[PDB]
Write a protein that binds this ligand. Structure first.
Ligand code: HEM
Ligand code: HEM
Ligand code: HEM
Ligand code: HEM
Ligand SMILES: [Ca+2]
Ligand SMILES: [Ca+2]
Ligand SMILES: [Fe+3]
Ligand SMILES: [Fe+3]
Lengths: 742, 742
């Protein structure tokens, strides 16, 4: 529209192209995911399992908590092993031992390297080629394979049950006793584990690589990166560097950095607060309180990684609040409090868009949304608690208990209710912008893009409802990453950028044209990479090689604007020196400066570390992912939510001054604790694990023997100091916000 | 000094640390290079070769032209194969065939995959472990290995001799008939080829990887990247991205972009020209004429890659001007004309530093330098011509003929004379700055750093004299890359930056403080990466794993300032709009803008494509290196030299106006021809080769059968159009410069 028509058309074209690519890859995921075999039958004719057994095992896995106990196909938690890789390696080792006894009369390790080479070529042929699914949907496995499977089942029954010989192992895995109490459910669960391993080690019908693109790294069957893996990794590096250079060129030639005269009074402080705006103090307190609870839950989960089952000393903690539960609550609370901060920012800005007045029952809607958020959080957490104790019967686990899928752990009922709450929030936003859009004579492009960002935030949680309990793992991964990657990464980024532009234009820090054009171009750039870059979560989950290529190349373009965020950091930081009333905004602006810094480091650097297929092939499911998760999710969106609620609190209680000493302490403790956690614990552990994964295979890097090495135990312990520093910073920030609002 | 003391100390500390690292790695190269075995003896006791035979083979290789016919250990030309990889693969294949006949009675390809696995583990053990050099300096090889070597010698005798059955192959290799006419010299040469292969396939005495860090990729003996290769590649990526982000942060927070009022008259045009300055018109013409001759030689060399021995039709061209000679002249002419442009810029600026007057006999010195440059060029080229025809007797080849080492192909005598000429140039510069340094009351920091850059340019050609004809290959590589990488990349970059600062400050486009601080910080940043980054040329030439780690990590820091060169590009481009007399500088400034663009793309992007060990392990010696070489060397330093001589010509004949139509045509034809060459020929060939190298091994990607594939032949042909466009641009620029100066 107007002078911004070309930018609007660029954004529309980018959206159409990128979503077409993502949707066609979704159809590919549906069509090319590893099949659940109708029957897995031994060469002698006995049926070992059927498709329904595998699906029941998937359900039982969800009941144990799924991705919050170990990982499957490289997704999940990092204390316990990746069950796919561990099962694959154990089964291959058993096959080799049995075959070596049958062929040379000794164990595999006691025969000559030549004999070992013969055995390994036999093993590779059997697993990769002979196990390929037949036309009738059947998988035929050898009798030796059947015996190998039967030999490793007791280990997993002990790990998931109450075997006194496996107790230590269970503690080393941060697993409670009787994670899956039912023997029959455990048998189904190990059917599902076998299925995963089979998909990871069986060539695609028309290819020489497996359904998982040869993941995990397993030298025994030559599970190694394909040539296309290397090629597309290098291509993504080239695209990243060229995009960075060209974006820098465009910034240098197309941006003049105009100087704007700051208004003498704060424009936002001049508008009288509406009742619904004043009702947002409880939202501010909810955000900071959930932040404190979340970091405390992280401390508890971390204690489980050094003391697997026991506190320092009443009752057994691991029976009722095991590592699985505390990890679930730690991740879900992160999502909840960041989202609540964003929603509070929106609900505060909405009446200002509506001319400083509330529509009818806007405060009632705000209160209803608050109550609904409490119901979602409390109900989902109670459901997790009763699912993990297996008090809740299995047939209700997916709807009310634990979905077992990371970041979407809450039961489907609570997910539906959260979707309804987000829709209600969107309604309360849009009804405050209708009148502003009906206004005559005013350019609405900035408001249009801000409203589009609102719609994205309030709608794109829906794809998390597109999979079911029995949905194939690959389909669930596709839709889950729609939510986690798209809805958070891309749409929260766009909403934050548009909110920045709208807010800073209203305060007079930026020109309308600059804010509008910057927001439109930034939205186009963010979407171009983020939308198809969703596929970097699906390299090894049963998607095809082409999905990996698209994910790598487009996700590289996500980093391009991130490493240049020094410009915006400087602008936001300089705003506080523009006037005396701008100095009242120092700490929200400092939070946004930290957002820029961590969007650069944690998102760009530590996400591209794990982004190329050649790297993620080896380090998917290692601690480098935890490094990136903490740095990106908190430093970007945690600091964004904190800055938002701090701004809201400043305008809700304008008579209260920020405590500069307390805020300095909290801000620098948060930043220093994040840096310290990464530098002294998480990154060294990830590097050591990466060395092990590249050298020996992923199963080794996740093994109990390797994770219990003294250096790794020490590094996990050492994290406590940085963890305490970070928690101190979080407590300071929460205290400041609570003092302002109450 | 003064306010710049911290910058000076930072630069000094960077220089000390980085040169200490590079020197300690030089000691490591001396101590850990693959030994030349005293004797290579069969298991039966017969001596196959001795150290002196290998060194004589090295000398004979130099006589054929060395790196200009094929490549050895991944360095050299790209038409003919990498003789190390080709020899290794041929010998391993012969060993496997002989062993399979002795063990199973059939060829290796006709036995079962299990039998092949047994044979390959035997082969790997023999080559990697049993071939390790003994304490007495001896290498003991099997009788089967001896027979395998004897079976492949006829092929190489045909390739390097006149065998009518190998004629086609020779044409496909762009090799003349009788490249090495002497049979005994050929036997020595194949001793040297064996030595290289042995070093590439034999484990280091204390390690499980070879002297070449497992290069080349050869699946037969598991010549695959080590774990440290992966680890340091990922580490270099992280360092690159973090450095880019932090440098952007520093630019945003520490640069204010001050506005400077342009003087009403051009300050440089006010100074009357000295006789030595006027004597530089012949230098300008020499630069552009050598540029035209160089691009024509490139066209001839490219014609040899599609028609290996024959022109379109008198006498046989390949006997007297073979591909080896035209390639040698193409590379040497590039060096000569870029260096001449830089020297002309210095010699023009020197009297301006001296207050606009010449010291005694400065014009005589300029004329003497001109004559010495002609003698070096003509003598070295004649020596190459008489070396490649073998008219020059072998004992004088290294001093007067062809060194066989790329970029240092000229005989050692001419290299010494060029060193003397560079010293004379340095003297003529420094004697014009003595009086400026003796001046009272003026800040000399900018002049000090500019003079330091002069000293670097005039001195750091010397390390090319630190190796001899019989020096070990690794030592020669270390010292050769001192010159090619350090002296050109780092010191030409620093000299160009300092020249930019000094020139633009004298014209009044920048403030003195800004120019000085920018130059000092840029010099520190460039040196920090460039100096230890020299080791990225030595990953697989017999250096250790630690050398690879240091090279990867520090070379990644070279890219950090390159991708941000949009800032300087915009500044240089904006200078032309500052005043009416600034518009007279449009085309030198356009050349410098192109320098920024190509320093970004060709240097940063296409150098980091090939920089990480994980990538360069597979693609060293492929056409991606040619992509990067052309883009970087011309677009950065070719455009730099062209802009320098254009500026000099503008000030030597101020009454002559630039022809905007001719210059627009030439500028855009050069840029478009470079882009086209890369996009339509060189990069696609490099990508296809990379796929082949990753999938099958380097020997396959360089093989005659692969290079003669119809797609690759077509892509080589297609380069002609872009080549003609580029040559048209070069002719236009040369015509403009000649019209101005004459
Ligand atoms: C003192 C503060 C914190 C501590 C001690 C902590 C500790 C932990 C631990 C022990 C895990 C599980 C590692 C495993 O799988 O074994 C984890 C995972 C996670 N935490 Fe934190 N955390 C803290 C702060 C935060 C914050 C502030 C956020 C977000 C705002 C956050 C988000 C996450 C996420 C997203 C994961 C899952 C990462 C993945 O699975 O890749 N954490 N944290
Ligand atoms: C604010 C921006 C971002 C946030 C909040 C974020 C958050 C996260 C989180 C929490 C995870 C852990 C997922 C899991 O537990 O399975 C993750 C994984 C991942 N991230 Fe991001 N990320 C961001 C940006 C990026 C960027 C820019 C890239 C690369 C260009 C990237 C690449 C990846 C990859 C490849 C994984 C998969 C790791 C694995 O499966 O082990 N992310 N991200
Ligand atoms: C129409 C213009 C040009 C053509 C047709 C051309 C062609 C070629 C050819 C055929 C080769 C040898 C490839 C092989 O090894 O088989 C080569 C190498 C080379 N040329 Fe050019 N060239 C041109 C312009 C230039 C310019 C302007 C420069 C420098 C200012 C340059 C510098 C080099 C260098 C440094 C190499 C060696 C690269 C390496 O070995 O990695 N060329 N060129
Ligand atoms: C103006 C700057 C540069 C110039 C003029 C330049 C020039 C060249 C040339 C001519 C070659 C071919 C060498 C040969 O034939 O063996 C080369 C190779 C190479 N360049 Fe650069 N380069 C520059 C910057 C860079 C940068 C920034 C990087 C990476 C950070 C880099 C990495 C490499 C590597 C790894 C090779 C080895 C290729 C091989 O051995 O096949 N260069 N460079
Ligand atoms: Ca996870
Ligand atoms: Ca070369
Ligand atoms: Fe993502
Ligand atoms: Fe270099």
């Amino acid at each position: 529209m107007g002078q911004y028509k070309k930018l609007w058309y660029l954004l529309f074209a980018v959206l159409a192209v990128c979503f077409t690519i993502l949707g066609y890859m979704g159809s590919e995921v549906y069509k090319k995911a590893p099949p659940y075999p109708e029957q897995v039958v031994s060469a002698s004719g006995k049926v070992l399992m059927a498709k329904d057994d595998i699906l029941a095992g998937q359900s039982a896995w969800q009941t144990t908590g799924g991705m919050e106990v170990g990982s499957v196909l490289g997704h999940g938690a990092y204390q316990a092993p990746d069950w796919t890789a561990d099962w694959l390696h154990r089964e291959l080792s058993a096959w080799l031992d049995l075959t070596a006894q049958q062929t040379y009369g000794k164990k595999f390790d006691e025969v000559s390297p030549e004999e070992q080479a013969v055995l390994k070529t036999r093993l590779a042929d059997e697993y990769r080629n002979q196990s390929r699914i037949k036309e009738d949907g059947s998988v035929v496995i050898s009798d030796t394979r059947v015996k190998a499977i039967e030999s490793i089942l007791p280990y997993y029954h002990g790990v998931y049950g109450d075997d006194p010989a496996l107790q230590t192992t269970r503690e080393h895995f941060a697993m409670k006793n009787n994670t899956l109490p039912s023997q029959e459910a455990r048998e189904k669960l190990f059917d599902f584990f076998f299925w995963t391993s089979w998909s990871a080690s069986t060539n695609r019908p028309d290819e020489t690589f497996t359904y998982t693109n040869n993941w995990p790294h397993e030298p025994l069957i030559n599970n190694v990166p394909t040539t296309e893996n290397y090629m597309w990794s290098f291509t993504s590096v080239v695209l990243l560097l060229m995009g960075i250079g060209l974006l820098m060129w465009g910034y240098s030639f197309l941006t003049k950095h105009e100087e704007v005269e700051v208004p003498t009074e704060d424009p936002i402080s001049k508008v009288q607060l509406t009742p619904s705006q004043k009702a947002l103090g409880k939202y501010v307190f909810l955000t900071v309180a959930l932040f404190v609870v979340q970091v405390l839950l992280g401390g508890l989960t971390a204690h489980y990684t050094v003391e697997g089952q026991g506190f320092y000393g009443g009752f057994e903690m691991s029976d009722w609040f095991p590592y699985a539960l505390t990890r679930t609550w730690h991740i879900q609370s992160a999502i909840f409090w960041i989202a609540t901060g964003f929603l509070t920012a929106g609900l505060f800005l909405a009446p200002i868009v509506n001319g400083g007045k509330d529509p009818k029952f806007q405060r009632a809607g705000v209160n209803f949304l608050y109550i609904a958020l409490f119901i979602v959080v409390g109900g989902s957490y109670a459901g997790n608690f009763f699912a993990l104790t297996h008090i809740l019967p299995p047939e209700f686990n997916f709807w009310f208990g634990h979905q077992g899928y990371e970041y979407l752990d809450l039961g489907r009922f609570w997910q539906l209710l959260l979707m309804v709450g987000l829709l209600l929030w969107l309604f309360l936003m849009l009804r405050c912008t209708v009148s502003a859009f009906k206004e005559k004579g005013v350019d609405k492009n900035l408001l249009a893009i801000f409203v589009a960002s609102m719609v994205g935030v309030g709608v794109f949680y829906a794809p998390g409802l597109f999979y079911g309990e029995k949905s194939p793992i690959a389909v669930m991964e596709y839709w889950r990453w729609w939510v986690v990657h798209l809805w958070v990464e891309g749409f929260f980024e766009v909403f934050a950028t548009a909110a920045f532009a709208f807010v800073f234009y209203n305060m007079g820090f930026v020109r309308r044209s600059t804010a509008t054009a910057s927001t439109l171009a930034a939205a186009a750039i963010f979407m171009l990479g983020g939308v198809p870059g969703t596929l970097h979560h699906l390299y090894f989950s049963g998607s095809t090689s082409a999905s990996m290529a698209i994910g790598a190349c487009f996700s590289a373009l996500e980093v391009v604007p991130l490493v240049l965020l020094g410009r915006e950091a400087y602008e936001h930081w300089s705003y506080q020196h523009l006037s005396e009333w701008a100095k009242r905004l120092r700490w929200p602006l400092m939070c946004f400066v930290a957002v820029a810094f961590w969007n650069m480091i944690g998102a760009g650097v530590f996400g591209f570390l794990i982004n190329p297929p050649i790297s993620l092939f080896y380090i998917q499911g290692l601690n480098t992912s935890a490094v990136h998760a903490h740095a990106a999710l908190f430093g970007v969106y945690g600091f964004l939510a904190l800055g938002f609620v701090l701004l809201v609190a400043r305008y809700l209680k304008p008579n209260v001054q920020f405590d500069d000493k307390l805020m300095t302490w909290g801000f620098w403790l948060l930043n220093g604790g994040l840096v310290g956690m990464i530098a002294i614990s998480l990154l060294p552990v990830g590097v050591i694990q990466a060395y092990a994964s590249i050298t020996h295979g992923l199963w080794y890097a996740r093994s109990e023997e390797f994770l219990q090495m003294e250096i790794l135990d020490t590094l996990r312990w050492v994290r406590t100091a940085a963890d305490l520093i970070f928690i101190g910073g979080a407590i300071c920030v929460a205290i400041q916000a609570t003092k302002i609002v109450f």
